[PDB]
Design a protein around this ligand. Sequence first.
Ligand SMILES: *[C@@H]1O[C@H](CO)[C@@H](O[C@@H]2O[C@H](CO)[C@@H](O[C@@H]3O[C@H](CO[C@H]4O[C@H](CO[C@H]5O[C@H](CO)[C@@H](O)[C@H](O)[C@@H]5O[C@H]5O[C@H](CO)[C@@H](O)[C@H](O)[C@@H]5O)[C@@H](O)[C@H](O[C@H]5O[C@H](CO)[C@@H](O)[C@H](O)[C@@H]5O[C@H]5O[C@H](CO)[C@@H](O)[C@H](O)[C@@H]5O)[C@@H]4O)[C@@H](O)[C@H](O[C@H]4O[C@H](CO)[C@@H](O)[C@H](O)[C@@H]4O)[C@@H]3O)[C@H](O)[C@H]2NC(C)=O)[C@H](O)[C@H]1NC(C)=O
Ligand SMILES: *[C@@H]1O[C@H](CO)[C@@H](O[C@@H]2O[C@H](CO)[C@@H](O[C@@H]3O[C@H](CO[C@H]4O[C@H](CO[C@H]5O[C@H](CO)[C@@H](O)[C@H](O)[C@@H]5O[C@H]5O[C@H](CO)[C@@H](O)[C@H](O)[C@@H]5O)[C@@H](O)[C@H](O[C@H]5O[C@H](CO)[C@@H](O)[C@H](O)[C@@H]5O[C@H]5O[C@H](CO)[C@@H](O)[C@H](O)[C@@H]5O)[C@@H]4O)[C@@H](O)[C@H](O[C@H]4O[C@H](CO)[C@@H](O)[C@H](O)[C@@H]4O)[C@@H]3O)[C@H](O)[C@H]2NC(C)=O)[C@H](O)[C@H]1NC(C)=O
Ligand SMILES: *[C@@H]1O[C@H](CO[C@@H]2O[C@@H](C)[C@@H](O)[C@@H](O)[C@@H]2O)[C@@H](O[C@@H]2O[C@H](CO)[C@@H](O[C@@H]3O[C@H](CO[C@H]4O[C@H](CO)[C@@H](O)[C@H](O)[C@@H]4O)[C@@H](O)[C@H](O[C@H]4O[C@H](CO)[C@@H](O)[C@H](O)[C@@H]4O)[C@@H]3O)[C@H](O)[C@H]2NC(C)=O)[C@H](O[C@@H]2O[C@@H](C)[C@@H](O)[C@@H](O)[C@@H]2O)[C@H]1NC(C)=O
Ligand SMILES: *[C@@H]1O[C@H](CO[C@@H]2O[C@@H](C)[C@@H](O)[C@@H](O)[C@@H]2O)[C@@H](O[C@@H]2O[C@H](CO)[C@@H](O[C@@H]3O[C@H](CO)[C@@H](O)[C@H](O[C@H]4O[C@H](CO)[C@@H](O)[C@H](O)[C@@H]4O)[C@@H]3O)[C@H](O)[C@H]2NC(C)=O)[C@H](O[C@@H]2O[C@@H](C)[C@@H](O)[C@@H](O)[C@@H]2O)[C@H]1NC(C)=O
Ligand SMILES: *[C@@H]1O[C@H](CO[C@@H]2O[C@@H](C)[C@@H](O)[C@@H](O)[C@@H]2O)[C@@H](O[C@@H]2O[C@H](CO)[C@@H](O)[C@H](O)[C@H]2NC(C)=O)[C@H](O[C@@H]2O[C@@H](C)[C@@H](O)[C@@H](O)[C@@H]2O)[C@H]1NC(C)=O
Ligand SMILES: *[C@@H]1O[C@H](CO)[C@@H](O[C@@H]2O[C@H](CO)[C@@H](O[C@@H]3O[C@H](CO)[C@@H](O)[C@H](O)[C@@H]3O)[C@H](O)[C@H]2NC(C)=O)[C@H](O)[C@H]1NC(C)=O
Ligand SMILES: *[C@@H]1O[C@H](CO)[C@@H](O[C@@H]2O[C@H](CO)[C@@H](O[C@@H]3O[C@H](CO)[C@@H](O)[C@H](O)[C@@H]3O)[C@H](O)[C@H]2NC(C)=O)[C@H](O)[C@H]1NC(C)=O
Ligand SMILES: *[C@@H]1O[C@H](CO)[C@@H](O[C@@H]2O[C@H](CO)[C@@H](O)[C@H](O)[C@H]2NC(C)=O)[C@H](O)[C@H]1NC(C)=O
Ligand SMILES: *[C@@H]1O[C@H](CO)[C@@H](O)[C@H](O[C@@H]2O[C@@H](C)[C@@H](O)[C@@H](O)[C@@H]2O)[C@H]1NC(C)=O
Ligand SMILES: *[C@@H]1O[C@H](CO)[C@@H](O)[C@H](O[C@@H]2O[C@@H](C)[C@@H](O)[C@@H](O)[C@@H]2O)[C@H]1NC(C)=O
Ligand SMILES: *[C@@H]1O[C@H](CO)[C@@H](O)[C@H](O)[C@H]1NC(C)=O
Ligand SMILES: *[C@@H]1O[C@H](CO)[C@@H](O)[C@H](O)[C@H]1NC(C)=O
Ligand SMILES: [Cl-]
Ligand SMILES: [Cl-]
Ligand SMILES: [Cl-]
Ligand SMILES: [Cl-]
Ligand SMILES: [Cl-]
Ligand code: NA
Ligand code: NA
Ligand SMILES: [Zn+2]
Ligand SMILES: [Zn+2]
Lengths: 561, 554
Amino acid sequence: ENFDVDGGMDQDIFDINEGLGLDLFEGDIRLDRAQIRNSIIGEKYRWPHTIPYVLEDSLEMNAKGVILNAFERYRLKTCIDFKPWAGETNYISVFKGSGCWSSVGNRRVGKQELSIGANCDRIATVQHEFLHALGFWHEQSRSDRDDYVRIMWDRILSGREHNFNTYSDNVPYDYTSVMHYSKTAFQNGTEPTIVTRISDFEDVIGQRMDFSDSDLLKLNQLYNCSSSLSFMDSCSFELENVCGMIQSSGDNADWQRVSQVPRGPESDHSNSGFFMHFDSSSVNVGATAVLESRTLYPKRGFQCLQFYLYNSGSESDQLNIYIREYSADNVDGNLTLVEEIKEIPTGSWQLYHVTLKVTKKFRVVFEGRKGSGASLGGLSIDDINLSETRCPHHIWHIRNFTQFIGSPNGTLYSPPFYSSKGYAFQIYLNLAHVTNAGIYFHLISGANDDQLQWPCPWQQATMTLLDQNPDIRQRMSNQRSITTDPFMTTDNGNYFWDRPSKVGTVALFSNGTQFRRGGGYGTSAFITHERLKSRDFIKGDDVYILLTVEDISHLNSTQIQ
Amino acid sequence: PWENFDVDGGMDQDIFDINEGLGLDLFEGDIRLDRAQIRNSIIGEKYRWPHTIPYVLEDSLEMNAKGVILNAFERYRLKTCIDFKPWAGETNYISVFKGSGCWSSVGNRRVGKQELSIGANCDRIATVQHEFLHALGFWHEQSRSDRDDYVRIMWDRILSGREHNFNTLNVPYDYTSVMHYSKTAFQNGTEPTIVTRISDFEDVIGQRMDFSDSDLLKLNQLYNCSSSLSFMDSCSFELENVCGMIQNADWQRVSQVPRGPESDHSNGSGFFMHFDSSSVNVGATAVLESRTLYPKRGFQCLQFYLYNSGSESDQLNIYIREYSADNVDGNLTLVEEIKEIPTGSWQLYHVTLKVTKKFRVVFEGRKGSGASLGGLSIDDINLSETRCPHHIWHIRNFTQFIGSPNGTLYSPPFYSSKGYAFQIYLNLAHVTNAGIYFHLISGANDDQLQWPCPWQQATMTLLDQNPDIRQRMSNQRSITTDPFMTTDNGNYFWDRPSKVGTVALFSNGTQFRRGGGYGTSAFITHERLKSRDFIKGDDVYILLTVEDISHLNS
Ligand SMILES: *[C@@H]1O[C@H](CO)[C@@H](O[C@@H]2O[C@H](CO)[C@@H](O[C@@H]3O[C@H](CO[C@H]4O[C@H](CO[C@H]5O[C@H](CO)[C@@H](O)[C@H](O)[C@@H]5O[C@H]5O[C@H](CO)[C@@H](O)[C@H](O)[C@@H]5O)[C@@H](O)[C@H](O[C@H]5O[C@H](CO)[C@@H](O)[C@H](O)[C@@H]5O[C@H]5O[C@H](CO)[C@@H](O)[C@H](O)[C@@H]5O)[C@@H]4O)[C@@H](O)[C@H](O[C@H]4O[C@H](CO)[C@@H](O)[C@H](O)[C@@H]4O)[C@@H]3O)[C@H](O)[C@H]2NC(C)=O)[C@H](O)[C@H]1NC(C)=O
Ligand SMILES: *[C@@H]1O[C@H](CO)[C@@H](O[C@@H]2O[C@H](CO)[C@@H](O[C@@H]3O[C@H](CO[C@H]4O[C@H](CO[C@H]5O[C@H](CO)[C@@H](O)[C@H](O)[C@@H]5O[C@H]5O[C@H](CO)[C@@H](O)[C@H](O)[C@@H]5O)[C@@H](O)[C@H](O[C@H]5O[C@H](CO)[C@@H](O)[C@H](O)[C@@H]5O[C@H]5O[C@H](CO)[C@@H](O)[C@H](O)[C@@H]5O)[C@@H]4O)[C@@H](O)[C@H](O[C@H]4O[C@H](CO)[C@@H](O)[C@H](O)[C@@H]4O)[C@@H]3O)[C@H](O)[C@H]2NC(C)=O)[C@H](O)[C@H]1NC(C)=O
Ligand SMILES: *[C@@H]1O[C@H](CO[C@@H]2O[C@@H](C)[C@@H](O)[C@@H](O)[C@@H]2O)[C@@H](O[C@@H]2O[C@H](CO)[C@@H](O[C@@H]3O[C@H](CO[C@H]4O[C@H](CO)[C@@H](O)[C@H](O)[C@@H]4O)[C@@H](O)[C@H](O[C@H]4O[C@H](CO)[C@@H](O)[C@H](O)[C@@H]4O)[C@@H]3O)[C@H](O)[C@H]2NC(C)=O)[C@H](O[C@@H]2O[C@@H](C)[C@@H](O)[C@@H](O)[C@@H]2O)[C@H]1NC(C)=O
Ligand SMILES: *[C@@H]1O[C@H](CO[C@@H]2O[C@@H](C)[C@@H](O)[C@@H](O)[C@@H]2O)[C@@H](O[C@@H]2O[C@H](CO)[C@@H](O[C@@H]3O[C@H](CO)[C@@H](O)[C@H](O[C@H]4O[C@H](CO)[C@@H](O)[C@H](O)[C@@H]4O)[C@@H]3O)[C@H](O)[C@H]2NC(C)=O)[C@H](O[C@@H]2O[C@@H](C)[C@@H](O)[C@@H](O)[C@@H]2O)[C@H]1NC(C)=O
Ligand SMILES: *[C@@H]1O[C@H](CO[C@@H]2O[C@@H](C)[C@@H](O)[C@@H](O)[C@@H]2O)[C@@H](O[C@@H]2O[C@H](CO)[C@@H](O)[C@H](O)[C@H]2NC(C)=O)[C@H](O[C@@H]2O[C@@H](C)[C@@H](O)[C@@H](O)[C@@H]2O)[C@H]1NC(C)=O
Ligand SMILES: *[C@@H]1O[C@H](CO)[C@@H](O[C@@H]2O[C@H](CO)[C@@H](O[C@@H]3O[C@H](CO)[C@@H](O)[C@H](O)[C@@H]3O)[C@H](O)[C@H]2NC(C)=O)[C@H](O)[C@H]1NC(C)=O
Ligand SMILES: *[C@@H]1O[C@H](CO)[C@@H](O[C@@H]2O[C@H](CO)[C@@H](O[C@@H]3O[C@H](CO)[C@@H](O)[C@H](O)[C@@H]3O)[C@H](O)[C@H]2NC(C)=O)[C@H](O)[C@H]1NC(C)=O
Ligand SMILES: *[C@@H]1O[C@H](CO)[C@@H](O[C@@H]2O[C@H](CO)[C@@H](O)[C@H](O)[C@H]2NC(C)=O)[C@H](O)[C@H]1NC(C)=O
Ligand SMILES: *[C@@H]1O[C@H](CO)[C@@H](O)[C@H](O[C@@H]2O[C@@H](C)[C@@H](O)[C@@H](O)[C@@H]2O)[C@H]1NC(C)=O
Ligand SMILES: *[C@@H]1O[C@H](CO)[C@@H](O)[C@H](O[C@@H]2O[C@@H](C)[C@@H](O)[C@@H](O)[C@@H]2O)[C@H]1NC(C)=O
Ligand SMILES: *[C@@H]1O[C@H](CO)[C@@H](O)[C@H](O)[C@H]1NC(C)=O
Ligand SMILES: *[C@@H]1O[C@H](CO)[C@@H](O)[C@H](O)[C@H]1NC(C)=O
Ligand SMILES: [Cl-]
Ligand SMILES: [Cl-]
Ligand SMILES: [Cl-]
Ligand SMILES: [Cl-]
Ligand SMILES: [Cl-]
Ligand code: NA
Ligand code: NA
Ligand SMILES: [Zn+2]
Ligand SMILES: [Zn+2]
């Protein structure tokens, strides 16, 4: 009884628009009057660094949330920002048209339409359409494209051959571009229409996870970006000056930059390769050592500190996180304990997220502490990232992951979680299919159910398969969102998102306690197993699914200004 | 030996030692403060140069200094979007002249003619780079407000009246900045005035080889640089898309070859391209082409490392395919045939190009007549719009000579562009510093050459073998032959070696005459020589260019 938003298919932008018969340039580009196809966009047809926008009322509620999520990716990785339209002469009007499409560049026409239609509410689709708005074309149309890919003309659907035309017009050809067609673009049959000449990229082309490194380089070079709104720092200890961090102790303890520890880890997490290590084996009980960042300058007032930790020491050792915030009244700073990380499981790298709310210049202080008893190792930290973003609400850590890919036993249910509004939920990850991974959001019976609004109204669940790249700026995480529509009905006439005790099926927790699970809402095409096995989604055989469930009923109201 | 001339006079004097010794009393040793300019203040947009800086090299400059300054401009052209042009009447320009010491104002002071001094002993490329970073608006690194978290100031060790030289986006403190004091700055005695908190960097501060990566990031961010004038491409095959190079594939991306090499050069983890000539017929070829490149200058230097585990009969052909509006598919020209490649070691090659339109480099491996058990491998390809070195001195098994009595090395003989025969002397025997000297030697053209040797500038570069040309901090010094220079006995220093030189033997035992050596006893410290990639696979490369600079007398 699960609901698949993708209807048992894996349709890209180009499959959605083809199925509607839109006949746009290269499937999703709306050419302007006398605009030259695949031509250089001049300075006059560019947006300012901050783009005014309107999210029109025709947009689906899930689409509005997804678009705002896309803006947060631009704010982390570029110096492009977006602001609600306040009367500027030109702005982007995002609306529910037929299919997903955009003009290429700032056409200087005042209100400029960008369509995010039905089935276009995917963050990378939004990112792709806004790259068109910013002035970018597709990658496979480059004049040198035949040196990198082969077009299988006999496999293209009759009358769709013109979508592969090249014109007359530097960064290397980018197979990973979010602006590249997939190998199945306009195919007639089961055989690919685009074959990469380098066999390694056959299943890479057509990625729809995030911007590629080359997509970002081109955009950041165009807008002269030297910073972003929400990136703060990334440290993997790869250089001897360790990103300006300063280690100290009053206890004959220290943090050492090492490539290995005899008791563990045998190597860094980044994966020659270095990490910081607090030895607890040869210091006295209660000895501490602090590793302090250089001074950082926040622009937003909320932050997410994240890092990987390895414990080869004792159950009694701990890592304390402090913030030292500086203000005019106290130049030595105000030191505050923000997190105590205790009883760290031994023998594996583990990801931690710490929520911060610092508004003044500050330093992050990592304090390793030796606890009671004996130790043969210590605490190791690597891949520290800091951004002015919200921490995920919940994190589902799946260990020994690879054994489940394409396997009949690959039907995984997350631990139960409580959303911000108090709804209890569970995630279902289906890895049993031969080619695609599926992901579904379920409401479950919870302690607050008697006082909650039913059917569940406009909660947006964002599920992110983390790309565990050492640098937050280089992660191409695979993210999908769904929104609970309180008017959605089942085949039997009941409300899909009603109270699980009323419409749910019986299930058991790992401990054997019975509960009610509502219908699952999600997609059978979350990611292909081939892409799931690429980049750093799996690292040390661990997978992380980040989860945020929030009320988006405030997005219903007309955008006024 | 005794006939050599050390330009550094048995010392290793930095900018701050030169100016201190003259009693200039400038801000932080080499900054000329403007009227009511606030010390170490943020340089506003109004006090910045345009992307192209107009300049004049004044006649007071020493001939060697003029050549060194133009060499410094080439470093800016490769690593930044800053360029330099001869002044043609722009409102503000930099007047480079021989003043007392090395110094500059900080920023474009908008005063019209703005002086920058490159005085006696300042004719070092990194000194020029440092003074032009001041002109561009940069101060020194150790004056940063957080500097006490990274270094200790030994106040008791500073010369009286010099304490003022130490009292003070989001890039970490840079120990390797070309703008950082060395540990001996303004010292009174033999003890350091600046001591890094971390013992590692104690002798790293004060590097004067080239820009650091953080120096370049700050400058490139300030001028929104997305390209440079002379960088074209760098490929170490670290990614599967192999930097857009095009080619079953005849060149294979591998991490090892059974008959050699056991690993990549850049240093599975590392990768290189390999043509397995052993598995194909005689006459078979393998073609690897760069992506399309867009030149801005009319001259280029293509460089790469090659490893041959195949036969002496295998070869590598280099073609250029140049594209123009009229040509349907480009114009292919053979530019280089690399034959009889010595086997069993990575070797650096340089190829001179003169392309003016968009083009591709075409690498063609060819299987020769002899039986082969391996193939040809290529790694660390770099292309820039620069002049190739005239000669390269490749020193194998280098490490054994550092600090050793036997570390007195003489290069093979070379012929300069004007026909002068020369040899390089590298002295590694000192406990802390490496020395380098240029000698003229007897050669076949000596009867037809002008004597004493007039205004030939010899540029000697210790190559930092980083895989990426943009990240090399190569250590370079130049000297110029002054035909009026005399010896203690009254003879001309640069006269004909048969007349003023000493008897020497080549490796083969043939006798020749060697003139006096001219160079420095402080070319590089052994500590810095052992850092970065100066030594790689126990190989060292000294790049050599010897050219006539009498045209700079103007
Ligand atoms: C087999 O396995 C099963 C599955 O694992 C087991 O089942 C679980 O069993 C446990 C134990 O029996 C059970 O735990 C209980 O959970 C209760 C619900 O927890 C969530 O909700 C509350 C309340 O949320 C409402 O209020 C907040 C504001 O306070 C608001 O933000 C929410 O939106 C929400 O509002 C809505 O509802 C109210 C009515 O409730 C309406 O008035 C309102 O209008 C809205 O509609 C949250 O507070 C909880 O969050 C806290 O706790 C979690 C977990 O510890 C923390 O992660 C989280 O940060 C938060 O922390 C708070 O407390 C700490 C101090 O401890 C503070 O520092 C911090 O600032 C926060 O205030 C959850 O999201 C919960 O109420 C209940 O609590 C009772 O015990 C505690 C002691 O622990 C007392 O202090 C309380 O007074 C209560 O007496 C208790 O924890 C699980 O719910 C249950 N799970 C499921 C899925 O069924 C099973 O037991 C096992 N079987 C066996 C045999 O082993
Ligand atoms: C122990 O070890 C000792 C040390 O190694 C050995 O000593 C060496 O022994 C060899 C063999 O006996 C000896 O070789 C000879 O070298 C002669 C000099 O070579 C250099 O100079 C010439 C001439 O330069 C002048 O002319 C050019 C233009 O024509 C001009 O650009 C120059 O600036 C210069 O001008 C000035 O002088 C002239 C007068 O000469 C004035 O008229 C003028 O006004 C100026 O004042 C250069 O041509 C040479 O360069 C060519 O060769 C080198 C090496 O091969 C190349 O790297 C270089 O690119 C260039 O290549 C040329 O040929 C290729 C062919 O494919 C062309 O493509 C290219 O375009 C060039 O034309 C040197 O820089 C040299 O003249 C002489 O040549 C004769 O033999 C060859 C045989 O192949 C014939 O072809 C010629 O016609 C000649 O008959 C010969 O090569 C070394 O000089 C000697 N070294 C030293 C330091 O002493 C010792 O032998 C050994 N003992 C034992 C027992 O083993
Ligand atoms: C040194 O730093 C301390 C820690 O600062 C916090 O942490 C660091 C890491 C950064 O993230 C900072 O930005 C952050 O403030 C300062 O103490 C903190 O002060 C703030 C007020 O400035 C205070 O916040 C209030 O909290 C109450 C609720 O308090 C309970 O709950 C918190 C946890 O949430 C708990 O920590 C407390 O112990 C309490 O049990 C809340 O009602 C307040 O809301 C109201 O305030 C805003 C205006 O500020 C208003 O717009 C709202 O509408 C609303 O009415 C407010 O959020 C923190 O609780 C407190 N934290 C701690 C651990 O003490 C510290 O400040 C000094 O102490 C404060 C108690 C207060 O007397 C200040 O005036 C003092 O300066 C600071 N010390 C100095 C000398 O600068
Ligand atoms: C196809 O390419 C051929 C090879 O080009 C060269 O090599 C490639 C790798 C690349 O570096 C190119 O940039 C090189 O040009 C072309 O042949 C060459 O053409 C050039 C002229 O474009 C010839 O040159 C001259 O060489 C003389 C000595 O031999 C010099 O005296 C002369 O100097 C004068 O040059 C300029 C004006 O151009 C003045 O400003 C100077 O002050 C000076 O007086 C030139 O440098 C070169 O010799 C040719 N090489 C060969 C091997 O033929 C070829 O070009 C065609 O043929 C030449 C002969 C001319 O008729 C061209 O007009 C003609 O296009 C290319 N073919 C096509 C069709 O494009
Ligand atoms: C060049 O000199 C190197 C250093 O010589 C040693 O130190 C001097 C200060 C002096 O006391 C001298 O007597 C010493 O021998 C030689 O390398 C050293 O060789 C010794 C003995 O073979 C060896 O134990 C050391 O590890 C080694 N040191 C270093 C820093 O490499 C060079 O010798 C060559 O290398 C040897 C390993 C050996 O194969 C020998 O036959 C080689 O000649 C000297 N090189 C040359 C070309 O003479
Ligand atoms: C999608 O692909 C299928 C399979 O290739 C296409 O169908 C095939 O189209 C060809 C067109 O030349 C047909 O061949 C011709 O058939 C006639 C008889 O019908 C014969 O007289 C000719 O000599 C020639 O063989 C082929 O029969 C047909 N096959 C099938 C199974 O239908 C289809 O047209 C493609 N669709 C699109 C939208 O591109
Ligand atoms: C990114 O930064 C670069 C500068 O580092 C900006 O480039 C500059 O763009 C302006 C036009 O916007 C060019 O202006 C020129 O002005 C003169 C008059 O002073 C006029 O004659 C020329 O026709 C031209 O308009 C300027 O040359 C150019 N500078 C360089 C070095 O390229 C670029 O605009 C910035 N990008 C964004 C999105 O802001
Ligand atoms: C580098 O590019 C930025 C724009 O991307 C330029 O910054 C602008 O500078 C003007 C004044 O010259 C201001 O009015 C704008 O507000 C700036 N825009 C932003 C977004 O900062 C900067 O001037 C360029 N630098 C150089 C040297 O040309
Ligand atoms: C899920 O299915 C796969 C494929 O059949 C199995 O490999 C997994 O088995 C687990 O791993 C093997 C190596 C062995 O240790 C076995 O005992 C494990 O169960 C299987 N996983 C689970 C959890 O059943
Ligand atoms: C560098 O050291 C190695 C030993 O580790 C020597 O074998 C090299 O000698 C050279 O190569 C051998 C095979 C033989 O041809 C010999 O005559 C050579 O000298 C040595 N290389 C150099 C240049 O000294
Ligand atoms: C993962 O695999 C190891 C064996 O390699 C096993 O000991 C461990 O319990 C497994 N973890 C989980 C969470 O299943
Ligand atoms: C240098 O140090 C000596 C010894 O302390 C001291 O007597 C002398 O005055 C100092 N000179 C200067 C110039 O500071
Ligand atoms: Cl999303
Ligand atoms: Cl790092
Ligand atoms: Cl130089
Ligand atoms: Cl100016
Ligand atoms: Cl180089
Ligand atoms: Na690391
Ligand atoms: Na390599
Ligand atoms: Zn598109
Ligand atoms: Zn200076």
